[PDB]
Write a protein that binds this ligand. Structure first.
Ligand SMILES: [Ca+2]
Ligand SMILES: [Ca+2]
Ligand SMILES: [Ca+2]
Ligand SMILES: [Ca+2]
Ligand SMILES: [Ca+2]
Ligand SMILES: [Ca+2]
Ligand SMILES: [Ca+2]
Ligand SMILES: [Zn+2]
Length: 455
């Protein structure tokens, strides 16, 4: 078969696969199937002016509307400055992914108008909103009293912030993943947990992800994988967002609180949406073992947590930087720059000419197909260390081995290991097809030996 290193790569690449199979006794839905499920009501805002974008205005009410007392909500109160600040960050997180804009101001001859306000009567629930096809479209209300103080101090990572994002989701036309004393047992599909959608009532533990432990609470502040697909299906994707080179995680340049990390103890939970450019997922500040997958629509285990980071469908992220732990880095079809950092890492460049950095420690560079590194577009290991690092080709040779020679003899399996002293450039040429010419090339910065190759 193959090496254990490859098996780990393959295992993680499929770990979160969705669709056409049962999970927890429930059908597994793909992102696209969930996009339809979340928009099953048919309600949405309409582009009245036909300008290609939903232009909405919103007001933080300062006085109760006509007929307010009849709602049975109790004492009315306006949003505090803190609530306003957080509400704007939630609105922004939705506008980043879909062609919808939110401007503070009174209703004008706009595609729609939204209102935000608090109430004190618990019988009204923690918070609620109306769909855009109702007579109270645009409205969202939040409970605040001595017994329920969650909405008084919303902040990145807490339920107060997710509540704002979730309720705004409803005003945009999103429903709950199912028609919800109900429990996850009543879910229509397996992925109905807040690891996939902030619209879900169920915790990520139901699907096996680990974000935090008892006593502590961690919630995604922004739209997750399935939410992004659902809102883009309704209003279209916003390709203008972060269309230039962007860095997420440590040393972030995304300018979003939920995409930024500054400490090894940070709890990241986000889905990456990016419009274009050369982008990097920098998770160098973590010391826990991580598993980073650059495949669009896939999940990664970051900062000691599992399934907490994902890349939205239709997004191509080019680079990833691991941490001081023993990480797995899986690239995509594009030319990627992958850095494992300290620790013994397993790196998989995939298609395209990748630039690989193993960093310190004993690192393994895995190859699953000849097309992964061809003479045309060959990979390069900028810091290979003979005797410590390894080039794994077992997925191709199936442990069949290679025949190291000085010149191709025309027999399949022939491999050539060359080096340049006054250049420190190494190279591994292989002829798998056996046509007398190399069909697989891997260049390195540093000397490579026959014993550094696993096949
Ligand atoms: Ca419009
Ligand atoms: Ca970008
Ligand atoms: Ca990109
Ligand atoms: Ca590492
Ligand atoms: Ca690649
Ligand atoms: Ca390393
Ligand atoms: Ca490659
Ligand atoms: Zn809801």
């Amino acid at each position: 078969g193959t090496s254990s290193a490859f098996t780990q790569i393959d295992n993680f690449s499929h770990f979160y696969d969705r669709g056409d199979h049962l999970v927890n006794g429930k059908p597994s839905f793909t992102v696209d199937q969930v996009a339809d499920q979340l928009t099953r009501s048919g309600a949405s805002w309409h582009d009245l002016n036909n300008d290609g974008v939903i232009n909405l205005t919103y007001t933080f009410l300062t006085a109760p509307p006509v007929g307010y007392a009849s709602r049975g909500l109790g004492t009315f109160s306006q949003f505090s400055a803190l609530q306003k600040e957080q509400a704007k960050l939630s609105l922004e997180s939705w506008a980043d992914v879909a062609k919808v804009t939110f401007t503070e101001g009174p209703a004008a001859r706009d595609d729609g108008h939204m209102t935000f306000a608090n109430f004190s009567a618990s019988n009204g629930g923690a918070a609620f909103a109306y769909l855009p096809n109702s007579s109270r479209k645009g409205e969202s209300w939040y409970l605040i009293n001595k017994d329920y103080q969650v909405n008084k101090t919303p902040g990145e990572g807490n339920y107060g912030r997710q509540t704002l994002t979730h309720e705004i989701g409803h005003t945009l036309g999103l429903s709950h993943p199912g028609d919800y004393n109900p429990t996850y047992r009543d879910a229509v599909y397996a992925e109905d947990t807040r690891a996939y959608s902030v619209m879900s009532y169920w915790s990520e533990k139901n699907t096996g992800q680990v974000f935090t432990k008892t006593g502590e609470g961690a919630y995604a502040s922004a739209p997750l994988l399935d939410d992004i697909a659902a809102v883009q299906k309704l209003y279209g994707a916003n390709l203008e967002t972060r269309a230039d080179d962007t860095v997420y995680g440590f040393n972030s340049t995304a300018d979003r609180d939920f995409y930024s990390a500054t400490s090894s103890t940070d709890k990241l939970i986000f889905s990456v949406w990016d419009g274009g450019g050369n982008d990097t997922l920098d998770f160098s500040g973590f010391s826990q073992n991580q598993k980073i997958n650059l495949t669009a629509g896939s999940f990664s285990d970051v900062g000691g947590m599992t399934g907490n980071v994902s890349i939205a469908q239709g997004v191509t992220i080019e680079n990833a930087i691991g941490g001081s732990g023993n990480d797995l880095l899986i690239g995509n079809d594009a030319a990627n720059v992958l850095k494992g950092g300290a620790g013994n890492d397993i790196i998989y460049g995939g298609g395209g000419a990748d630039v690989l950095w193993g960093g310190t420690g004993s690192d393994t560079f895995v190859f699953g197909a000849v097309s992964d590194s061809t003479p045309k577009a060959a990979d390069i290991i900028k810091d290979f260390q003979s005797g410590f690092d390894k080039i794994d080709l077992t997925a191709i040779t199936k442990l069949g081995g290679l025949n190291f020679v000085d010149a191709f003899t025309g027999h399949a399996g022939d491999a050539i290991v060359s080096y340049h002293q006054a250049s420190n450039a190494g190279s591994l040429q292989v002829d798998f097809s056996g046509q007398g010419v190399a069909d697989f090339l891997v260049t390195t910065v540093g000397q490579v030996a026959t014993y550094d190759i696993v096949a």
